[model samples]
Target: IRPTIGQQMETGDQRFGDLVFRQLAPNVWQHTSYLDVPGFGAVASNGLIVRDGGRVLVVDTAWTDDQTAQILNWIKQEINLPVALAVVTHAHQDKMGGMDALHAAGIATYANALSNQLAPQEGMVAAQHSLTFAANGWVEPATAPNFGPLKVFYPGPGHTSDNITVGIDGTDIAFGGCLIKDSKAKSLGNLGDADTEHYAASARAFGAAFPKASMIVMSHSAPDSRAAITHTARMADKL
Candidate 1:
């Protein structure tokens, strides 16, 4: 069954071909877009749409510029909220590939400082705003209003050295980006830029940091409970 926060704000699930949006909580929606990769077939990448007062905060972008623009247009036309900021979770294409679209739209963009440095090497544009974090440390909206109500954290290195996760303040929702896998995942996906040695530790730290998290959104898979963090750590231990 679909989840509902309240009667007045309830917006049912919306689909747009390969892109879809599902309301996860009050003023928070999960946006997913698909990318067709040769060996992997069609892969889905997930992000978030969080409403903050009259503006909105988008987490990550679609796998391509066109789809990213679709999201922006939908927000403007349907959700009636201007995108105030966008935060990239990592340097991977699934995370920051549509940066050009965001920049062209004149939307502010942010990411971890390391993500800004690595994105260029990955053939992606870096976000305009960035904040450096110590290991297992976090930066809240207090430090950067562009972050909105999200608390961005760096739990060491996992799927990528620059990967970061964001927890919605005052909510149980947490976007794990590509670091935490889905419950059904048997192995950690995409090791091209992964830190194999510290992957497990990173997953553990992420879980520890968001102990109250109930809905953990992951890229390339369906949202899962906090157990997904442990699943990711266990998978990393075997590798």
Candidate 2:
């Protein structure tokens, strides 16, 4: 049987250097790190680790390479599974900052086309070993590339033009990266790289595509109780 929203996540050991690990489901885990950014102060950024058998797939990276390495070490010491691949949800340093470390460890990294384009331009740490998982098409990836059990797609522009969401089909759990905000957010957190004009419409469209998603995760916050597109829409009203 599939796990319900409430039952999916459980309390676990939450400790790491500038990082915390939490369970989202039996096979899904969320890892967060406190990052010092230019204007956001000490920001809390979220990533993911999804396990299936002996293979694991990570959604994003920590705020820095060192922090990300700590997450990997814990995964190796505790989970004991080999990381098969890592996915960068966008071009922001919070998402792809650890790409170089991951590449050094010989793990392949994947990103949406727009992320690859913007990363180098933003002076964000470039993932030299990165490959494109989704290119600009009329729609999000129709062919769900297998990243374990994830259905990855580029759900248009919101947080950034390159942001993508990773969904687990049966459970309807989506790792929304930075595109979706937490319930605590009263307004859109960052507009520096946001498509403010189209943010609301894009969020609505993305939410419409996955109406079954019971949980939505933001990159810099805890998982949401439900799909957060409505929240994004509400916040976008300020734009």
Candidate 3:
């Protein structure tokens, strides 16, 4: 059975072994799964679960198909809401490692067109749906609420050429994917596909686009305030 809101508030999270889900807002929850790297030990990747009307929209997936499958099970049993759609913020494994899982479930998955193009090369599966960004590097919902309550925005190139951030409409919450680092981050996490020259600019663009976003969820760390975006820009400026 689904836990009550008060129960969730007391524990702060619902754990399914290594996969955990925490309520972030009235309609939003944060999901985190761990991946053990050879040198980094156990690393966590975060995502968002936003309830929209009778359906749910997921942002990013876990680090593996098994973990993602667990998340899907939790949604079905705990949240009890059918997932309407999902969007990957980039082509990295942390963002799309479970693309196959999503596809297998027949859930419509979306990613930036460029992310889709880069997925296979990164040893990840591309999303089923592709979103082409506008010339200004933004892709707002065509209608009042196309992708539920989320808006996708590409701020030049920072973490990856196809990196994008998602903002929740009518809310101060935004999912920065890996484009913006957490406040505790000391340096840029990965640079394998990063554009160091334009990283700072992209971060600034992200900040400008979501001036009202007080809570920005990042992939590798816990959610932080908008100051995390500024912190990222500062670190990128040194590159």
Candidate 4:
């Protein structure tokens, strides 16, 4: 059951630009939202894929599997590895809905206990909300899997309660879930669904924690550099 609120996403039309694919580095690529559909708001979630020698790791599943699969297909054309990791940044269906598809491809899912524990609850909430609002949808809960040298940091409650980020061993790449974005908007818009106080605290914690980070990959934009996190922090302070 594929659930999408494309019409709801279709709301923010003016902010949308053409979705273009860009290569961030040797193996990393960003498939950005073509248009900032009104309902989806101007904040477009991004999915970052890292192609190592034999496997590809996906950070933050996209809005739709169709979108994720499209990226996966593109990765397949370039590499001989399987879809390695399907990491969910938060419990949001938009970020995790495409996971089952990844799992079907023999890809394993991994998240912290908070995400592993709360996602089903989030799914239920979405299911109930969708009963009245077609914009919401259900996600088949994903189980946590084994991870390697990548030590994923699951700091509690930023954008959502189960928000997490990971530090890649070899690459100076860190994946920040929904907690941070690479947007230049006045203030990082709160999901209204997060613990604002906790969110702010976590935001501060990340900045202090990852000072050595070179590139911070956000879930929703092509901008996944240190500049993005610094920009997001600056914007957060201004807000």
Candidate 5:
């Protein structure tokens, strides 16, 4: 059966600034920050805010430091839960662009070593309140830092070599990041750094490992069923 919809709220807009927040499951919320990219036009980049106990886990950063700051403030006021940690899904601006804001607020951030390394070279200043992922190995089955109910894993390369997926331990929610596309995408959104040959396999492996995930929250658009992964894998095959 398809997953049931929950509470979704639009908290901002382009003129006045807006962030769309949707409750995917109990304690799991998806937030999309709207911003205009030079060539990409206006886009709704997605992220997640997961609650566990009295703390929250922020999955990705907003499209800008301005937006990120707003998100942080809003979370503090509305959720009233201390943010335990934030994960940067990739090195892209839409994913990690808010590092400066996050750092300014003293909110800790996490990213795989790949992103930590690449983000700086790509022009993003080093993060202030965070560091890279697990200390031991860069490849799987490397252990990642625990973030409440979230489980982080490297599902191989797809959207970017450093792309990773985070799953909510007890629920059917998976934050697929940019590595997995939203249902409305007719093709892979961006491939400036994609590993085309391995994209399909990586996506399939992720689906296999998390066969129980009924809801998949992507990076640039609305969340969808596991079919989003299936759809992405199929599209990857044709590339």
Candidate 6:
């Protein structure tokens, strides 16, 4: 006896983002828009789909296999390219549970230093609990994908320890991970794992890093102005 995902998702409906499944840019991609997890409402988290020409790369797997399947199904229908890589933004469950699906298909997978450094047991537990709590798991890809661009800087522990920000170069869209919310395109949330002060510093670096980014898309916020960068400073005023 568990709560239905729709029910759990709608608990905080106003804050929840759309359950998206689409291509956001040229090579880099994601389920363009927000996703409200079963139990975690408005608690923004993201799963990415990266494609370089026909090469498909998944940034972060959603919370469960069903969720992962929902996305993969869309890919299968719309695009023929297989997933080249599955990136685990961190050891966090919501972002990491899709490995099983990717690995089954022989897709490569990667995680940040912090997440990769986690002891096997800890990693196992993180995966196990998430799967159990959320009915999640992934199909192992036939081959694996590469993990690099390996950006690990200050604000090091924001959101999830191994937080990542992905960029779709030509389209000028940045999947700011969970750190940059659509609510505040380019800023800090100071969500637990991330160090608040460092997060501020990191946001500054992001500003310099993706100067050309015209739009900011968060898994839990609306697609933003391609040329705009929402900041914590601005979010602070609103909140």
Per-candidate total of colliding backbone pairs: 0, 0, 0, 13, 3, 36
Ordered by lDDT, highest first, the candidates read: 3, 1, 5, 2, 4, 6
Best candidate, lDDT = 3
What overall lDDT goes with each candidate model? 0.83, 0.72, 0.84, 0.57, 0.75, 0.50
Clashing pairs for model 3 are: none
Instruction: List TM-scores for all candidates, in order.
Output: 0.90, 0.85, 0.92, 0.71, 0.85, 0.66
Query: Cα RMSD (Å) per model?
Result: 5.1, 5.6, 4.8, 9.3, 5.3, 9.3
lDDT of model 1 at position 139: 62
Q: What tens-digit string does per-residue lDDT give for candidate 4 at 34-61?
A: 2244565444566567776677777766
Model 1 misplaced stretches (Cα beyond 4 Å): 1-12, 38-40, 140-143
Model 1, span 58-152: residue lDDT tens = 99999899989989987887689788999899988888989999999999999988889887788999999987775447764454675658788
User: Which prediction has more favorable lDDT, 3 or 5?
Assistant: 3
Put down candidate 2 lDDT per residue, 41-114, tens digits, no spaces: 56677788988788988888887888889889979977998898887888887888887778777777777766
Please give, for residues 185-231, the per-residue lDDT of candidate 5 as tens digits: 68887899999988998888778767798988887656788888989
TM-score for candidate 6:
0.66
Best by TM-score: 3
Model 6 lDDT tens row, 142-216: 212233332322234345545556555455666666666554344444465655545554444555666677776
